[PDB]
Structure formats: C-alpha cells, structure tokens
Amino acid sequence: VVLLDVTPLSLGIETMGGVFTKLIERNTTIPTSKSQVFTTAADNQTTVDIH
Amino acid sequence: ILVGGSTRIPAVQEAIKRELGKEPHKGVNPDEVVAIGAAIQGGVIAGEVKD
C-alpha cells in the first residue's frame, strides 16, 4: 500500500499564552509520534492546562 | 446555608428549614465559614497562570 504517507499539518501547542510551537510538522509519515517537555509558566503553578 | 457561630442553636435551626426547603447546611464551622470562603477564592486567584 504505502498509504497515508503524509501529515495534514504542523502540530504544536500553547506556549506563552498562545504562541504556537511546532513538534509535528506537515507532510510527515502518519504512523509516528514526537515528544517534548515544557516546564512552569510561573512559580508555583499548581496546575497546567494544555491547548 | 448558615453562618454566624451563634447560629448553632437548637431553636434557630429547628425553626428554620421547616418554614423553608431542606435541612440547613452544616459542618462548615460558621464563625469562620466566611473567612474560609475568602481563602478559597484567594487560593484560586493565585492559581491563574496555566502557560
């Protein structure tokens, strides 16, 4: 087959109130996963939302 | 609800819910109930930053 060999869009998430950073780019062979680790917005973040 | 540490009384209580809807709300220790509320909402006010 060699199908769904491409990724719809660059995927990333919500930095610094919405500034968008990529992990996944576009065009990327679909059966894959990429991982990244952020840290604290501000001292004592009791919790973190993800967008 | 209830407040007002003197509120823990036989007859106040007995005499209320009956002229009213269900069983008066309990266990929150009235003389501080309010201060308790304060602190809660404060805790929340610090818990702002989710970035």
Curated annotation (Swiss-Prot), chain B:
Q: Which domain of life is it from?
A: Bacteria
What turns on this gene? By stress conditions e.g. heat shock.
Q: What does this protein do?
A: Acts as a chaperone.
Family of the protein in this entry? Belongs to the heat shock protein 70 family.
The protein in question is named Chaperone protein DnaK
Q: Species name for this entry?
A: Geobacillus kaustophilus (strain HTA426)
Q: Which gene encodes it?
A: dnaK
Covered part of the full sequence, start to end and full length, is 307 to 357 of 607
